[PDB]
Amino acid sequence: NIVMTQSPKSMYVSIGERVTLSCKASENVDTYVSWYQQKPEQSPKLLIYGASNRYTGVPDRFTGSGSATDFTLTISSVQAEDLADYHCGQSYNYPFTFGSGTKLEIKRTVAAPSVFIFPPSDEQLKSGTASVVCLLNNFYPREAKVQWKVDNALQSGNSQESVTEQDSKDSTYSLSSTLTLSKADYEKHKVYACEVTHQGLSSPVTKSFNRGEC
C-alpha cells in the first residue's frame, strides 16, 4: 500500500568515498523508515531505525536523515565491508513495506570482453540436444549483450545467459549465453555466430563456427 522506492537500483562506488542512497515513501511515513544491510549469504541487518538512529553496533561511518516522503542513507566513506545490499523499510502502516533495494559495487576502468565460442560436443549431440556456449570473459561494466545468429537468422527465446558477480581480485564480470536446439535443428545449419556488443568494444565482435571445418 505505502509504496517505498529506492534509487539508484545499483550504484558503483570507489573504496573510501561518501555515497548517498535514496528512498521515497508513497505517502508521509513520519520518520518511520528504517535501513537494513544485507550481504549475499546473510539475512538483513538493522543499521538505522527510526529515521536517523545508528542501531546498536553500527559504525559512526553510517548516518541517516529524512522526514516525510524522502530519506537517504549516507555511507560517509565506503570500505570492503560496506559493499553489499541496502533495503529501505517502513513500519508505520499495515502492511509494512520494503523498497526493491540497491546493490553496492566497486568502480574501475572499462574492460572490453573476450569472447570464445564452443561447438557442442559429440556426446551431447548423440542424445538429442545441441548447446552452443558463447563466453564473454572479464568485461566491465556489467552492461553487456550477446546476439546469437544461426545462418544469419537472429534467434529468439531459445538462448539463456548467466552472469557472475565482480571477480574478487580484478573486479570484473563474466557471462555465458547458451543456445540449445535438437541435434536435428542444429544439423540443418552450418554457421553459428555470437555477436557481442559492450561499451568497451569500439564495434561489436563476433565469434563464429562452422560444423565440420575449423
Binding site: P44, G89, P95, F98, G101, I117, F118, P119, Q124
Partner: protein, 220 residues
C-alpha cells in the same frame, strides 16, 4: 545472546503445505512479536505477518491472509508459519525477525524453500573444447557444461583443486525442464594446452554423481 534462528532449507512439490520454525534465546517468547518476511530470489523483502506469543494475536499481510497461518508455541518457545498449497511462485527464502520495538532488530538465518515437482537426477558433463583459433592470443579457454540436474548444488573443481586460477563456475540456471544447467570455464595459456592436462571435477551429491571429465583440444 537472544538469537532466533530457522532451519537450513527444504524442497517440496506444488500444492503442498509446509511448516517452518523460529526461536527464543533469552529474553521472553511473550515479550515481542515475531515477523515473517518472504524474500524472493533477486527481489525486495516482502512482509507476511506477526503473531504475539501469549494471546496469539495475529496480523497477516492482506495478501498472505488466506495462504499462510501464523501458529505459535509458548511451551516450546518457537513460532511457526504454514503455507497451504504452495506454487512454483512461492519458492523463496523465509525469515522470522524478533520485532524489538515496532522495528525488526534481531533476525534469524533464512530457511530456503524450493518448490519443484522434478525428481532427483544426476547431471551430464560435456566438454567445452579449447578455443585457441584466432583465440591463440596467449590464453585459450575451455570448460565443463554440467547439464540437466536436480536439485542443487553441484560443486565444480578443476584438477582436484590444484588449479584455482582463472576458473569461473557460473550460476546454474533453471530450464523449461525444471532441471538446472551449470557451466564452469577456466582460461589457460594457449601454449599449455599440451604442455599440461586439464580435468574438471563435477560432483552433484543428491543423485550421488561424481564424474571427472577431462577436456582437451578439439581435433578440428
Amino acid at each position: 545472546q537472544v538469537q532466533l534462528q530457522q532451519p537450513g532449507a527444504d524442497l517440496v512439490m506444488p500444492g503442498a503445505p509446509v511448516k517452518l520454525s523460529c526461536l527464543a534465546s533469552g529474553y521472553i517468547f511473550t515479550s515481542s512479536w515475531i515477523n515473517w518476511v518472504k524474500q524472493r530470489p533477486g527481489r525486495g523483502l516482502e512482509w507476511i505477518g506477526r503473531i504475539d506469543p501469549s494471546d496469539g494475536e495475529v496480523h497477516y499481510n492482506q495478501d498472505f491472509k488466506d495462504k499462510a497461518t501464523l501458529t505459535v508455541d509458548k511451551s516450546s518457545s518457537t513460532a511457526y508459519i504454514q503455507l497451504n498449497s504452495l506454487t512454483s511462485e512461492d519458492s523463496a527464502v523465509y525469515y522470522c525477525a524478533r520485532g524489538f520495538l515496532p522495528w525488526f532488530a534481531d533476525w534469524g538465518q533464512g530457511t530456503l524453500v524450493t518448490v519443484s515437482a522434478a525428481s532427483t537426477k544426476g547431471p551430464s558433463v560435456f566438454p567445452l573444447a579449447p578455443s585457441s583459433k584466432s583465440t591463440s592470443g596467449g590464453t585459450a579457454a575451455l570448460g565443463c557444461l554440467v547439464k540437466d540436474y536436480f536439485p542443487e548444488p553441484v560443486t565444480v573443481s578443476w584438477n582436484s583443486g590444484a588449479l584455482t586460477s582463472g576458473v569461473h563456475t557460473f550460476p546454474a540456471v533453471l530450464q523449461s525442464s525444471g532441471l538446472y544447467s551449470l557451466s564452469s570455464v577456466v582460461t589457460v595459456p594457449s601454449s599449455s594446452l599440451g604442455t599440461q592436462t586439464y580435468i574438471c571435477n563435477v560432483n552433484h551429491k543428491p543423485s550421488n554423481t561424481k564424474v571427472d571429465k577431462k577436456v582437451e583440444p578439439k581435433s578440428c
